[PDB]
Design a protein around this ligand. Sequence first.
Ligand SMILES: CC(C)[C@H](C)[C@@H](O)[C@H](O)[C@@H](C)[C@H]1CC[C@H]2[C@@H]3COC(=O)[C@H]4C[C@H](O)[C@H](O)C[C@]4(C)[C@H]3CC[C@]12C
Length: 1165
Amino acid sequence: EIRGVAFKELFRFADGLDYVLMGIGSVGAFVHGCSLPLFLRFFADLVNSFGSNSNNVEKMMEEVLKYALYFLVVGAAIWASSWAEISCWMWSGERQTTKMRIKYLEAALNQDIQFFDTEVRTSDVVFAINTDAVMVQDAISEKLGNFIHYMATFVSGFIVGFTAVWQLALVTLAVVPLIAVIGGIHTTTLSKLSNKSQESLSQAGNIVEQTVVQIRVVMAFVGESRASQAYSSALKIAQKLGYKTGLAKGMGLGATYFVVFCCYALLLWYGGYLVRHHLTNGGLAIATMFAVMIGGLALGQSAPSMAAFAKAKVAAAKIFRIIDHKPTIERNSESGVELDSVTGLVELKNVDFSYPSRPDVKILNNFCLSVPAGKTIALVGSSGSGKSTVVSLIERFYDPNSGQVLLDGQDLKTLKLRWLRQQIGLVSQEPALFATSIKENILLGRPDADQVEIEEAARVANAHSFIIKLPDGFDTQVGERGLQLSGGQKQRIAIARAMLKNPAILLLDEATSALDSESEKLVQEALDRFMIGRTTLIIAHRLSTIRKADLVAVLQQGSVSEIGTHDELFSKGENGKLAFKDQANSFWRLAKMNSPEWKYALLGSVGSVICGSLSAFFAYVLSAVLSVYYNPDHEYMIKQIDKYCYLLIGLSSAALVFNTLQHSFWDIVGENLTKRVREKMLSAVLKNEMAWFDQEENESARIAARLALDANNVRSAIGDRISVIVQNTALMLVACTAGFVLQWRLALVLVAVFPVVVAATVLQKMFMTGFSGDLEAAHAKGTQLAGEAIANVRTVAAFNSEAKIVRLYTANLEPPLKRCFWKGQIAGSGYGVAQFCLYASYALGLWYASWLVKHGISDFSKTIRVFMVLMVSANGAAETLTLAPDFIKGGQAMRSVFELLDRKTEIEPDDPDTTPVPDRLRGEVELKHIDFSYPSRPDIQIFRDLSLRARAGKTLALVGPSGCGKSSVISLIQRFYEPSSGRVMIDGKDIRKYNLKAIRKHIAIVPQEPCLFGTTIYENIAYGHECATEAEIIQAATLASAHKFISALPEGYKTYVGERGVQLSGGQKQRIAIARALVRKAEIMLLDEATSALDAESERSVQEALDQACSGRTSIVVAHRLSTIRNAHVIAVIDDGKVAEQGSHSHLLKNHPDGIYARMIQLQR
Ligand SMILES: CC(C)[C@H](C)[C@@H](O)[C@H](O)[C@@H](C)[C@H]1CC[C@H]2[C@@H]3COC(=O)[C@H]4C[C@H](O)[C@H](O)C[C@]4(C)[C@H]3CC[C@]12C
């Protein structure tokens, strides 16, 4: 484990402005922290004056006025301090982190390639840029300010409480730990249970992902229910964990309320005792209790900043480790001769390079390669030979071991590499394109070029292409949102960037196997014009360029064998605004969908209202006790205080019980709703046809992501919404009725500003969480550019364009900087305004209470009770709003799930219109005049009114060009896609009117790539038939010969096979797929060209298994390899969507000579 760097080093990249910002933010944070207990002290003074001066009205009025002015001053101070703190801390952190990001990327780019090979992985570098974008910035921007603020709040609260009433402060200090302890336990318990629920949800998502990637075989058979059952099990586990989560949350809230009620019972009694003995005032005691509570909670809230500091220390240690590293290979050297003879006569003698990470094995051991001066060389060394090692050595990526290696007669170390790499042009296996515009992606080959040179290079040496046939053209920033690039466009861009480096050698290598000939001919003309270009890593891919090269010296077993002529070369290298009515309707339909849980909801609802009442009740008690404090009759005050304390102790238990009840039952409602909706979504998805799966936004992990993300916000938007809207309604109703009954006038004035108080307290809690948004989302563009640069470090170094990448990174990072500055300003201003309005409302309400008392309208007791009850109830309501407010996201996901459910399938897997189905369908399939067009590409028509047919009980083999959709025929058979036109019949009955579900069990299919359903081979084989028992799969394995390795397998049938388990060989996987096909004992077998890339033993085994599989009943096979259709007695030709020759291969080979069969026979020779 790396040792975290000390805290001070985190501020390495701080300049003078950052120091000023940090100082101003620190002062603002200190003032913001201190001004809360100061407000409590001023409130105590105001209440004490307003209660003591009942007889002397004028003194009461003037003192209340001065303290209201103090409240306004404190509000203004809070406004200024919070604004300064938030803005300065956010912007300073962002600036420092951006500078450090830029320096990190700059240091990473100019590192040696061997650094990434051995020291730090590229994935580690990308993760490090994630960590520097998150943790270091978070610690030095928001966590530090919050730590200072909470230290200030803690110290100020303790000072205020002690200097007011040291006695009660000590008692309140002892009460603080209990509340803090319960809060910590509740938070930890929920986090642990949340982790359990999270992994359970991941399991459910994995099931959906697996089902979608295997949707073909799953739909081809009858696995739709099987998949739903597995999903049901995972959902059940998740809801059980959710039940625990909900019960734990309820218990935590109940426990903290119980402790709070009992502790304030004790504190209020002790405050009454102190008031009896003339040791304090009422307001002073109340403020002391509040201040000490605030200080303790502030320290508790400050601890997470320390946690963040530790994590960021570790992260910054890693980042500074990578930054401070110094490259070993010398760059910007002074030994460069800068020779103008760009032609490389001959070089690379006696190279003895050994791979840097592992010195045990060496490739370039003792041999020489040598080159001419202006003639290409083709290099073909086995398969895993060090063909790329020569390219790397030429580019000076590494260095040869102790020997004598030169270039052009002037060595490599004595020619620099800043301009040496300028002479050399490199084209990689896969072209490396960066997030900038394609125009700049042409520039970085030579920044000194102008527009005219770029366009002439792209035009005379490349054909007109998508760059000009484009809405944007030169300003076409690709990035992650790059347009459709099939490989040819980006490849041509890469060679163009290459030709901008006109002189000297140009290095080639193999491209993708499926590439158009235009790129190859452009490469050929590029190497012809730059005859200095040699060292093509063709690895036996273009015999024409091989004949072009004067020397085609090979690198067999990592060594040169023959150098010179290129004549025979045989037996070597044989490899080739949003609406609201719709939201209301969807809400109503989900509620109707949630009907079976109604009981729980009602009970939960009951608990909610009672919980709300308790909160209001608590507020009232405080008010009452305070109002009782300023009562001359001591015995009456004793009786009242005892009554209130006993009532509070009694109702603490009710608070606990009904908090647990409410949260448990609402969580049960929510979990049941999520499970039901998720199952319905999966069923609706599985009912859809394959054309729906082919469409975009509709495949693999992304559909699983939509399913996972559109259920939790649904549970929120139903359960949490109703729970809060009823509990806060009960709270507000009780508080408002108490306030009205006491003094309706002041109650009305206060409920005028009630939303302002609630909003301000909500913003206080949000400040507690933080106002910096998703830092990752802000720097997404820069992060992806940096990842592309680091992953493509070899290409960047080859084109010596590190500075260009750095400046592009800076230009991408500037808009996040500006956005962060403005966001900080807006957030600080808004928070300050809200707090100022809160304190202005407090001052106005309390002054109006004083004014009412002055004119004999009311009393001190009633007015103070109204004020305190309404304000504490506002705080409680805001604390209630802290529950997940994902309502808008909930509505959006509501619409998403509803449109997913209401989608209509064109092909219904079910058979509502039942048709007669024979028990043993013989299956005389006849695809007569079937006109089918590629679903993905309508223009492409694999079938053109082809009258294909196959007599039942007979084997038909489909042969023809790979381009024609011979496999697409089997898709039409399973009705995955419907032919653009034409009618297909299945044994005397058309399949359209026929029942698809009955057909599925009479059809067996083997995919070209076998797929792994689950853990055991047992279940994979049993998947073929609905009720496979045990003997049936035994015979399936024996006839399929799958048992041969199964007995050899340690666990046999029950071995864990798949991605994580024992990965069987391709032949074994295909053989078990064939076995599961035989399990279904279907009359019609649709054999696919699975035997594509296998070794000799696996080839023979899989063709044998195919021999037993196709034997018996009827089988439509598609094949392209000899000794496969020969066994079949009926062969068809798929030429251009039409049938050409029908009959046995031997029968049609004798007559009409030079036939299409003879064509592939001659080709296979
Ligand atoms: C005199 C008040 C009306 C004052 C003007 C008001 O603005 C102030 O913010 C009140 C509502 C605060 C000050 C201290 C707060 C309390 C702090 O002391 C406590 O024990 C905590 C524990 C726990 O966090 C409870 O959920 C809230 C609870 C019990 C708080 C409830 C709200 C307060 C009582």
